[PDB]
Amino acid sequence: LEDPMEEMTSYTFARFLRSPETEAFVRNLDRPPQMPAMRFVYLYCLCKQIQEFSGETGFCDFVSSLVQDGPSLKSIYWGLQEATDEQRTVLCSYVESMTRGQSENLMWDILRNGIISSSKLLSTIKNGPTKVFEPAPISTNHYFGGPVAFGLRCEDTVKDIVCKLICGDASANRQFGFMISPTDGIFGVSLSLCVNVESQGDFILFTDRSCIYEIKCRFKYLFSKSEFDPIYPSYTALYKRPCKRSFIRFINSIARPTVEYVPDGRLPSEGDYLLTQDEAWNLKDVRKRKLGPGHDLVADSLAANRGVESMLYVMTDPSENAGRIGIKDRVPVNIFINPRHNYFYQVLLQYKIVGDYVRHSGGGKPGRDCSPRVNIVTAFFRKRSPLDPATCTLGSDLLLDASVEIPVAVLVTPVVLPDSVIRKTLSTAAGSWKAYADNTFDTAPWVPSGLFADD
Numbered sequence: 001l002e003d004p005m006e007e008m009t010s011y012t013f014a015r016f017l018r019s020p021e022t023e024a025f026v027r028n029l030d031r032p033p034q035m036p037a038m039r040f041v042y043l044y045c046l047c048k049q050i051q052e053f054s055g056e057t058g059f060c061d062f063v064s065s066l067v068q069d070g071p072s073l074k075s076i077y078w079g080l081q082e083a084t085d086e087q088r089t090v091l092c093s094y095v096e097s098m099t100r101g102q103s104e105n106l107m108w109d110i111l112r113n114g115i116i117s118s119s120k121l122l123s124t125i126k127n128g129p130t131k132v133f134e135p136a137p138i139s140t141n142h143y144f145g146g147p148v149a150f151g152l153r154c155e156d157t158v159k160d161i162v163c164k165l166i167c168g169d170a171s172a173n174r175q176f177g178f179m180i181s182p183t184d185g186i187f188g189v190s191l192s193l194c195v196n197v198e199s200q201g202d203f204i205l206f207t208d209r210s211c212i213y214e215i216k217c218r219f220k221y222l223f224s225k226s227e228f229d230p231i232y233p234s235y236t237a238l239y240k241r242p243c244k245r246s247f248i249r250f251i252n253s254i255a256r257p258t259v260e261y262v263p264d265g266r267l268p269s270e271g272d273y274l275l276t277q278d279e280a281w282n283l284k285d286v287r288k289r290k291l292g293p294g295h296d297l298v299a300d301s302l303a304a305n306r307g308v309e310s311m312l313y314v315m316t317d318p319s320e321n322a323g324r325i326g327i328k329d330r331v332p333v334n335i336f337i338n339p340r341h342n343y344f345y346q347v348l349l350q351y352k353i354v355g356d357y358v359r360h361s362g363g364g365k366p367g368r369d370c371s372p373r374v375n376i377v378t379a380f381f382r383k384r385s386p387l388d389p390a391t392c393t394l395g396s397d398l399l400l401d402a403s404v405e406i407p408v409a410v411l412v413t414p415v416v417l418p419d420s421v422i423r424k425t426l427s428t429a430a431g432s433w434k435a436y437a438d439n440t441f442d443t444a445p446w447v448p449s450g451l452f453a454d455d
């Protein structure tokens with residue numbers, strides 16, 4: 001009779017918005033029900049139920065201290081309407097710490113209904129928000145066996161490298177819950193890694209020396225230390241002579257390369273998410289022109305980013321080095337991000353939401369700006385040779401999981417994000433939310449006027 005969360009799966013935001021109890025107070029409101037308030041009331045109600053069989057009363061006691069047997073939804077909707085942003089962001093990071101442990105849990109899912117997640121922002125812009133008001137499958141998790149299993153299996157080791165090697169410290173928060181954007185209650189984010197975060201016992205205090213790191217492991221670049229493998233040669237060349245020239249040949253050793261040469265004022269394709277205008281990278285052809293016609297957004301971003309220089313890190317080969325994976329070399333390179341690609345959006349929301357936390361959490365210094373830095377780590381692995389030692393340490397002393405493949409390169413790319421671009425993007429996205437909420441509810445909650453479209 002155990003797993004009471006298997007039961008709470010009917011109590012999604014959408015459903016709450018459709019409750020008779022909901023409708024109760026929204027009848028006797030003056031205004032179209034406002035929206036972060038509505039989301040926070042829902043959260044309070046889902047908690048009131050959950051807290052029983054999970055003991056953690058904490059979220060609710062906060063909501064309670066805001067209003068002065070349980071208080072009536074009108075008392076609650078109204079104290080949440082009057083709350084200061086700090087107080088909002090507290091509530092959000094109650095929900096964050098409340099989910100930190102288990103991305104596997106079912107609550108992670110119930111919370112995701114009605115929230116434009118960051119992975120789904122570009123899709124949501126292009127196709128609209130219906131998938132965002134829809135249940136999410138088993139996946140499975142059983143015998144995963146391919147690109148997506150490669151993803152999960154490694155996305156650890158790459159944090160180990162980022163934390164320990166790239167910035168000199170392994171004491172960094174790697175587990176992140178679900179972070180609702182506190183000021184809007186519409187968007188959501190889950191961080192991969194983020195450096196310079198501090199604690200409050202259960203809470204994670206983002207400081208303003210925060211660095212976000214989106215991790216991607218390029219499965220299409222997997223290869224073996226073995227004659228006949230096609231990438232291997234161009235790689236041993238990289239190893240021995242690390243630099244732009246060598247690395248170009250590596251990037252280009254597969255059918256579909258991950259960097260794309262697109263010259264200033266041309267529109268980039270969509271292949272994937274790295275671009276470069278640096279000439280050395282140019283071996284054939286011509287590009288549609290990216291102008292006026294809408295491309296204004298991708299144009300402002302392209303401009304802001306094509307000055308960005310990324311760092312390549314060439315790792316030492318564990319086999320040639322008594323099992324040591326250290327930073328052998330540090331080639332700087334001229335590669336930046338594809339503002340057309342899915343990731344650019346995912347990483348823009350990750351930057352917008354954390355900005356918000358950082359700001360309204362004890363933490364902003366007048367005169368100075370607290371937007372974090374964002375980067376995309378693009379990790380290159382090879383397969384395990386028979387030659388490689390059974391055991392391996394990153395650096396001197398960090399074990400490396402025996403199931404994981406060998407890290408070979410790591411390419412970190414700063415992302416630059418004009419407030420210009422953020423405002424519109426999120427804005428046309430949130431009207432899309434409104435849009436659907438309007439003819440699915442009856443009482444659609446009104447969007448905060450800071451995601452209002454225009455001036």
